[PDB]
Write a protein that binds this ligand. Structure first.
Ligand SMILES: *[C@@H]1O[C@H](CO)[C@@H](O[C@@H]2O[C@H](CO)[C@@H](O[C@@H]3O[C@H](CO[C@H]4O[C@H](CO)[C@@H](O)[C@H](O[C@H]5O[C@H](CO)[C@@H](O)[C@H](O)[C@@H]5O[C@H]5O[C@H](CO)[C@@H](O)[C@H](O)[C@@H]5O)[C@@H]4O)[C@@H](O)[C@H](O)[C@@H]3O)[C@H](O)[C@H]2NC(C)=O)[C@H](O)[C@H]1NC(C)=O
Ligand SMILES: *[C@@H]1O[C@H](CO)[C@@H](O[C@@H]2O[C@H](CO)[C@@H](O)[C@H](O)[C@H]2NC(C)=O)[C@H](O)[C@H]1NC(C)=O
Ligand SMILES: *[C@@H]1O[C@H](CO)[C@@H](O[C@@H]2O[C@H](CO)[C@@H](O)[C@H](O)[C@H]2NC(C)=O)[C@H](O)[C@H]1NC(C)=O
Ligand SMILES: CN1CCN(C2=NC(=O)/C(=C/c3ccc(Cl)c(Cl)c3)S2)CC1
Ligand SMILES: [Ca+2]
Ligand SMILES: [K+]
Ligand code: NA
Ligand SMILES: [Zn+2]
Ligand SMILES: [Zn+2]
Length: 801
């Protein structure tokens, strides 16, 4: 219970931690219905608006006014933000020329530049193009500070998951806010945008910035604002807090605006009605900058202008209905709209039949505008599976469309033309980032990056040590003038062996057969020694193994590999394909050829008998026989230590990748270096499985079956230089392909591979960093580039938009 009869006199927007029965006066009291009776009259003053006029200059201080134009207001810290312009002949901040801020210019008493995070809801990156015509203050921040062309939100691309991701550096599956609405089966409780349940701390995991700051002795302003507090009051409050005594003043501040999201939903992103809310936001930014200038702080504070997601054209007319596919939709609950999450209406309903549901939802219309996925089958880049609040059954919805349970759930007259929530690589979902201030660079454009990276950077800006999170610390050092984080290479845990010849073909009984033999490499005395293999096929040093295991480096004319004696296959296989390289066939007599590897014990080798027994599993090769340098060298490709288990369904994709796509990439990029390998993630947590976690093996054997296969394709950013002779920065694209027994995911898979395989790979694009998590490997350790630049490279996602 709260004793409302208290008073907010001398307590308006206090940073005091005040708990019941005491009366509250903070920017969240209205949300808890715990404000003092006089909060609204003392703290939410509105009299005479938010701007000084000429007739108010030098007025007698009336404490009834929203803001002041009295002579004393400046030292009192509560002038209207335009006071000095109207009453003292100063210019607005926006009319001032841009000038580099090389060090903080702060008043005495300021020990460090404060950080102000200005968040705008639903600010699509492309709105920035409207420029100073519409948003002159924001355009000044963008052009004079540091900007990205866009920032990638997390999936789902909705507000709650993204705001909390910004605050924590975590994927939603980790922080727990996996949607604006969610059901937790252990709580048996439902979280909603609106309502009280979301105020319970049990939903919110990880460690948000304000907590990290507080725990390390840095004072945070209250980040959240009750929706009823107008933006002008939020700004005036931030400015007042900045005028506080040295021993009370916070170091970090957050402003939030619900626009331009609301107008985007109403009018769509390209609606002419969008100009008005963009102008209003800019006006708020201007009030903040004008205010900071009045406090002599405009060359002291770091400002981050950041959005949570974008906005797409979505209308009633583009709604898919599950009732068109399923017989009894009244028995399921659907989290609907720009994504789908399905569970039974009655929790744990025993009659719930997910396989039959998915079957009815799979490629049933030629123009179907969503695709069903068990969550472990979602593209790994989405990182959206490892949480009990994420339903097993998901629908990835096509941009511009909605999914709904049945037509009763749509009300045409419809009232909306915009929405968001889609796959976070969709262009319309991208949002904004600008950094302005002493610690940011001046007039600098940076490549787009993911919002999970910002928490580390805000920690850097504040001198904080970040809690464990999913950013890669150092990958954004290029945004900063100083306060960069000097990263340190992780230490290799397992050193490799370099086995020579220690066995004879007679030592092997694996059930393998090869109809021909290369008797010439048996006269090769330097066969499978290092030679120039490493400098040709391993351009950036060997991957470090960051876990305890046993593996062997194996050399070949056409490739090198790191063969695991535990998992019975390479952890990685690395090779370079020149622009001019030739594709060749697998000769008829070699179709079923598999050769034992004298370098590796028969005990640490797979056996072809298992593959003859398993009627469902087949096999493939990591280095492709199609790309052998010579008919002689091609024999290396058929080694048992280059072999991996693949379903025939997957082989349709992999062979087309090996035979057509790799050469296509080499042609277009002036040669490519490829590293390919297996991934084991049976518990779908995005992390390398331990042996105990692997759940499937080749029939009657102990050869483990990968859940995915990766490939990392690197070339010279300067495409005029061949990949193997690159002087400067690198260019990378990667994939994590799901290893599945069918191609149900690809609706056109009945057709030739040229009609569907690339479309699949694009969906499963990945960061090198993703692969590192999944493999326990560390790539690019030996290059001519800074470690910070390499970290940037590893976080890059090739999106194909
Ligand atoms: C993204 O980065 C994060 C942060 O580093 C990584 O997540 C971490 O992974 C490790 C390895 O599995 C986990 O270590 C385990 O910790 C548990 C005990 O963990 C408890 O205590 C920690 C510390 O206070 C706390 O963070 C944990 O919070 C989890 O559980 C809470 C209550 O259920 C929940 O509120 C919170 O959201 C979070 O849940 C998430 O993680 C759990 C797994 O712990 C998962 O089941 C859930 O679905 C969410 O994903 C928890 O109270 C020990 O018992 C183990 O032995 C082991 O040491 C960390 O717990 C985990 N940290 C967080 C914050 O998630 C991700 O791996 C990384 N992803 C990628 C792909 O790189
Ligand atoms: C709720 O708040 C009111 C106002 O603070 C409290 O009223 C005061 O109570 C004290 C002690 O009984 C009196 O001496 C004062 O005269 C009261 N102050 C005013 C301004 O009226 C009231 O006690 C609180 N109720 C509780 C504690 O449950
Ligand atoms: C999947 O779709 C089929 C139709 O393609 C549904 O089959 C109908 O189901 C009812 C009862 O099972 C039958 O009486 C109808 O004759 C069927 N319709 C037709 C035209 O075949 C099936 O119910 C759907 N499955 C689920 C789980 O929704
Ligand atoms: C439905 N909802 C209304 C309120 N809401 C918020 N109101 C605020 O004042 C918020 C401040 C904020 C500002 C920055 C960050 Cl990083 C975070 Cl986590 C929160 S967030 C979220 C969307
Ligand atoms: Ca795992
Ligand atoms: K077979
Ligand atoms: Na198919
Ligand atoms: Zn939003
Ligand atoms: Zn919205």
């Amino acid at each position: 219970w709260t004793n409302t009869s208290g008073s907010c006199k001398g307590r308006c927007f206090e940073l005091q931690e005040v708990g019941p029965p005491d009366c509250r006066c903070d920017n969240l009291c209205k949300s808890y219905s715990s404000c003092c009776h006089d909060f609204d009259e003392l703290c939410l003053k509105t009299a005479r608006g938010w701007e000084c006029t000429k007739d108010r200059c030098g007025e007698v201080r009336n404490e009834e006014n929203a803001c002041h134009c009295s002579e004393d207001c400046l030292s009192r810290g509560d002038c209207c933000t335009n006071y000095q312009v109207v009453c003292k002949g100063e210019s607005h901040w926006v009319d001032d020329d841009c000038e580099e801020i090389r060090v903080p210019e702060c008043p005495a008493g300021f020990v460090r530049p404060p950080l102000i995070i200005f968040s705008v809801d639903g600010f699509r990156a492309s709105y920035m193009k409207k420029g100073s015509k519409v948003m002159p203050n924001i355009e000044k921040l963008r052009s004079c500070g540091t900007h990205a062309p866009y920032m990638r939100p997390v999936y789902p691309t909705k507000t709650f998951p993204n705001l909390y991701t910004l605050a924590t550096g975590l994927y939603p599956e980790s922080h727990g806010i996996v949607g604006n609405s969610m059901y937790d089966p252990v709580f048996d409780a439902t979280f909603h945008l609106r309502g009280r349940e979301k105020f319970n701390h049990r939903w919110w995991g990880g460690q948000p910035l304000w907590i990290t700051a507080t725990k390390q002795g840095v004072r945070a302003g209250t980040f959240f604002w009750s929706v009823s507090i107008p933006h002008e009051r939020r700004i005036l409050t931030i400015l007042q807090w900045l005028s506080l005594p040295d021993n009370e003043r916070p170091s970090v501040y957050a402003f939030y605006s619900e626009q331009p999201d609301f107008s985007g939903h109403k009018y769509g992103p390209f609606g002419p009605e969008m100009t008005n809310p963009l102008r209003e936001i800019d006006k708020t930014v201007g009030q903040l900058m004008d205010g900071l200038k009045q406090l002599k702080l405009h060359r002291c504070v770091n400002v981050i202008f950041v959005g949570d997601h974008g906005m797409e054209d979505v209308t009633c007319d583009r709604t898919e209905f599950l009732s068109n596919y399923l017989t009894n939709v009244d028995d399921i609950t659907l989290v609907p709209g720009t994504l789908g999450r399905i569970r039974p209406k009655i929790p744990n309903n025993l009659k719930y039949d997910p396989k039959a549901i998915i079957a009815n939802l799979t490629c049933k219309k030629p123009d179907q505008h969503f695709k069903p996925y068990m969550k472990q089958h979602l593209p790994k880049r989405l990182h959206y599976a490892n949480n009990r609040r994420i339903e097993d059954l998901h629908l990835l919805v096509e941009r511009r469309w909605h999914v709904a349970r049945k037509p009763l759930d749509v009300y045409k007259k419809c009232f909306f033309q915009g929405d968001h929530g889609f796959d976070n690589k969709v262009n319309s979902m991208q949002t904004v980032f600008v950094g302005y201030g002493p610690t940011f660079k001046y007039r600098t454009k940076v490549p787009p990056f993911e919002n999970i990276e910002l928490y580390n950077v805000m920690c850097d800006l504040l001198g904080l040590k970040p809690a464990p999170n999913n950013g890669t610390h150092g990958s954004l050092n290029h945004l900063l003038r100083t306060n960069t984080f000097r990263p340190t290479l992780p230490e290799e845990v397992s050193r490799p062996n370099y086995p020579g010849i220690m066995y004879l073909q007679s030592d092997f009984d694996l059930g393998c057969t090869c109809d021909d033999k290369n008797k010439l490499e048996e006269l090769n005395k330097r066969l499978h020694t290092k030679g120039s293999t490493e400098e040709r096929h391993l351009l950036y040093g060997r991957p470090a193994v960051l876990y305890r295991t046993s593996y062997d480096i194996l050399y070949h004319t056409d490739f090198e590999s790191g063969y695991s004696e535990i998992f019975l296959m390479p952890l990685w296989t690395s090779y370079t394909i020149s622009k001019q390289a030739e594709v060749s066939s697998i000769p008829e007599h070699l179709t079923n050829c598999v050769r034992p590897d004298v370098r590796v014990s028969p005990g640490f080798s797979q056996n072809c008998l298992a593959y003859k027994n398993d009627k469902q599993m087949s096999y493939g090769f990591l280095f492709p026989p199609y790309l052998s340098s010579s008919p002689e060298a091609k024999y290396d490709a058929f080694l048992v230590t280059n072999m991996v288990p693949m379903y025939p369904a997957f082989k349709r994709v992999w062979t087309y990748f090996q035979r057509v796509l790799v050469k296509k990439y080499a042609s277009e990029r002036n040669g490519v270096n490829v590293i390919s390998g297996p991934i084991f993630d049976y518990n779908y947590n995005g992390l390398r499985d331990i042996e105990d976690e692997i759940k499937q093996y080749v029939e009657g054997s102990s050869i483990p079956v990968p859940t995915h296969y990766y490939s990392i394709i690197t070339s010279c950013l300067d495409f005029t230089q061949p990949a193997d002779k690159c002087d400067g920065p690198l260019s990378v694209s990667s994939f994590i392909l799901p290893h599945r027994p069918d191609n149900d995911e690809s609706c056109n898979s009945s057709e030739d591979e040229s009609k569907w395989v690339e479309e699949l790979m694009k969906m499963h694009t990945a960061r090198v960093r993703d692969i590192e998590h999944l493999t326990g490997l560390d790539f690019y350790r030996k290059t001519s580039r800074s470690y910070s630049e390499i970290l940037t490279l590893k976080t890059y996602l090739h999106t194909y938009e």
